[PDB]
């Protein structure tokens, strides 16, 4: 034998499948941000609905209760460090009215279009996938990075991509090898 390897499932579908007032607000997020399927939106409601449950009972036990103070001021501290809670909303009741696009506005697909690198929200997810953008020194290629707050200011192009750096791709090299040698013949 050996030890077993833990895993977890990360989303959850909803109870009523075909009812129309749900189906549109999911649609207007998938066109606003450009997400592939609605499994990507269930992924952000799961993660939210365990944050909300975690604060939902530290509120029940008393104040000046040392489990509220150790597990509270860490949950608050992690949400600000990625930049979802506002810096003036550092109180535990304020996380109970958090919303689902306050995480959706921190992905790399959304934080690169706002910071002036791509002309549309679909020019982001194809710029990232093809290894062009590199926070720090690291080419990432995941459209759901959830950028930390003190590293919003490091995003740029890559020191290998033809856009922000060296040699052109194998169209322009192929076109230069289609015309410059063909200038004599």
């Amino acid at each position: 034998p050996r030890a077993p390897r833990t895993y977890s499932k990360t989303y959850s579908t909803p109870k009523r499948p075909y009812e129309s007032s749900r189906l549109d607000a999911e649609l207007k997020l998938a066109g606003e941000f450009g997400l592939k399927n609605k499994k990507e939106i269930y992924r952000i409601s799961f993660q939210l609905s365990k944050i909300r449950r975690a604060a939902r009972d530290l509120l029940t036990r008393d104040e000046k209760d040392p489990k509220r103070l150790f597990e509270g001021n860490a949950l608050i501290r992690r949400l600000v460090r990625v930049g979802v809670l506002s810096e003036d909303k550092k109180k535990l009741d304020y996380v109970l009215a958090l919303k689902v696009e306050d995480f959706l506005e921190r992905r790399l697909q959304t934080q690169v279009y706002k910071l002036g690198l791509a002309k549309s929200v679909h020019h982001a997810r194809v710029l990232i996938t093809q290894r062009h953008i590199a926070v720090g020194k690291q080419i990432v290629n995941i459209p759901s990075f959830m950028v930390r707050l003190d590293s919003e200011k490091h995003i740029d192009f890559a020191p290998t991509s033809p856009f922000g750096g060296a040699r052109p791709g194998r169209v322009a090299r192929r076109n230069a090898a289609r015309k410059a040698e063909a200038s004599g013949e």
């Binding site: 649609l27 066109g31 592939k36 679909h122």
Partner: peptide, 15 residues
Amino acid sequence: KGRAYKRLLYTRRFV
């Protein structure tokens, strides 16, 4: 087919 199809449906009922 893919994420581009969700773009197409966004126009044909919401633009």
